[PDB]
Amino acid sequence: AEREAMLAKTAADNRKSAEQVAAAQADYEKEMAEARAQASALRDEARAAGRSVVDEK
Amino acid sequence: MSIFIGQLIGFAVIAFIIVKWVVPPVRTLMRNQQEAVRAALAESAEAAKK
């Protein structure tokens, strides 16, 4: 059985290590996407505020 | 004594036969079994490293 579980974790471990490489990237690109969406929306709001101040003056 | 000598020579002949033709394969099959145990035992360890 010890041999059994060794075989077990072993395989599951290699597959889940590949899955964790994939998960690390995916987490990177999701966090980067969220941050860059925040940046783009902030720049758009800044441009809108600039269009408002231009209208005011 | 004669019976003892004869059966002892027969035992020696069969021992030689098994040592020269039965011992080698059993030995190497076991060798491979253990070698593969080794390989897998390791795998686990390294995959834990990965």
Number of residues that this document lists for chain A: 57
Query: What technique solved it?
Result: cryo-EM
Q: Are A8 and B47 in contact (CB under 8 A)?
A: no
Sign of CA dihedral A16, A21, A24, A27: negative
DSSP B20: I
Q: Are A20 and B48 in contact (CB under 8 A)?
A: no
Q: Give B-chain residues touching A17 at CB under 8 angstroms.
A: 47, 50
> Quick one: how far is CA A21 from the chain centroid?
13
What amino acid is encoded at B49 in this protein?
Answer: K
Give CA–CA dist A49/A37, Å, rounded: 18
CB-based contact A13 B40, cutoff 8 Å: no
Contact residues, A window 3-32, toward B, CB-based 8 Å cutoff = 3, 6-7, 9-11, 13-14, 17
Q: Are B39 and A7 in contact (CB under 8 A)?
A: no
Burial A8-41 (b: 16+ CB within 10 A, else e): eebeebbeeeeeeeeeeeeeeeeeeeeeeeeeee
Among the partner-chain residues B40, B48, B50, the one whose CB lies closest to the CB of A7 is: B40
